[PDB]
Amino acid sequence: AGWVIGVDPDTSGALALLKPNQPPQVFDSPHLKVKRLDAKAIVQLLKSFEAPIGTTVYVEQSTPYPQDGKQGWWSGGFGYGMWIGILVASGFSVIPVPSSAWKSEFQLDYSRQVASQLFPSLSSLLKRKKDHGRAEALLIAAYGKGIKIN
Amino acid sequence: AGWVIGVDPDTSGALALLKPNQPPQVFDSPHLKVKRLDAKAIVQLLKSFEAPIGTTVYVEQSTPYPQDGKQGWWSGGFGYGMWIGILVASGFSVIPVPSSAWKSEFQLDYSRQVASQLFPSLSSLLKRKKDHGRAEALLIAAYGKGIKIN
């Protein structure tokens, strides 16, 4: 049983969980009740999976807008660093993934429609512009599952 | 048995471990073999402590030089985020601490000499300018231990 997790580490990102012979699942990244990721709630979400130790997690490499201030670059690195630290500390095998990696394999901005096509049972969850993070997480997971025959 | 850990999260930072009725200890933050923190080695160091769950960890709030580029602010946030994520994921109780907090309680740049005075048995480890991170980690731990009678 080889699970694959895909993570969009942005503050409006998400986590996708793909288990073999099971429908896909996706989870909005929890935020504090202050736009800020909630490390405690991320840890608890991950722990609730009871995933096999060493389960592979693919994390999109955060790259910031060219037009972002100094606290904006600090914030993107903080969130990416928090996810890496959480995942490595939780026993997962962590593979950073440039956004170009999955965007290239899936014709890619159409990520929401592309995710709906690959994961029809989740299309209701990708209808709105806010669902971009859910879409990226699913595509990253799909990418990390690889091309494989039965 | 109430342990206190102090962490300077900078790339040349360090971790200080204070146990009751034991001499203090300090550890350079491990780096990759590429200036880059090594998340796997940080996790393993923390796990090797076998600390009580919920042990309190005080982490200096990373603030970057005003004169630092966009990748420089991204790097300081990444390292601070990685430490927070590692510590929360590892079950510790994490308290961020402004540098002003301990600098104010210990007359504070003289942190290396101040650390040597408070922790004489470690003064050999604070002799060089490279030992700044060790000094800050110890001061943060001393600060987090609090003022308390026997």
Author numbering:
A (entry chain A), B (entry chain A): 109 to 142, 150 to 223, 231 to 272
Sentences from the paper on this structure:
Recently, mutational screening analysis identified the chloroplast-localized HJ resolvase MOC1 that is essential for chloroplast nucleoid segregation in Chlamydomonas reinhardtii and Arabidopsis thaliana. MOC1 exhibits dimerization and an RNaseH fold, belonging to the retroviral integrase superfamily. Moreover, we characterize a base recognition loop (BR loop) that protrudes into the junction and disrupts the C–G base pairs at the crossover. Residue D183 from the BR loop recognizes the cytosine, determining the cytosine-dependent HJ resolution.
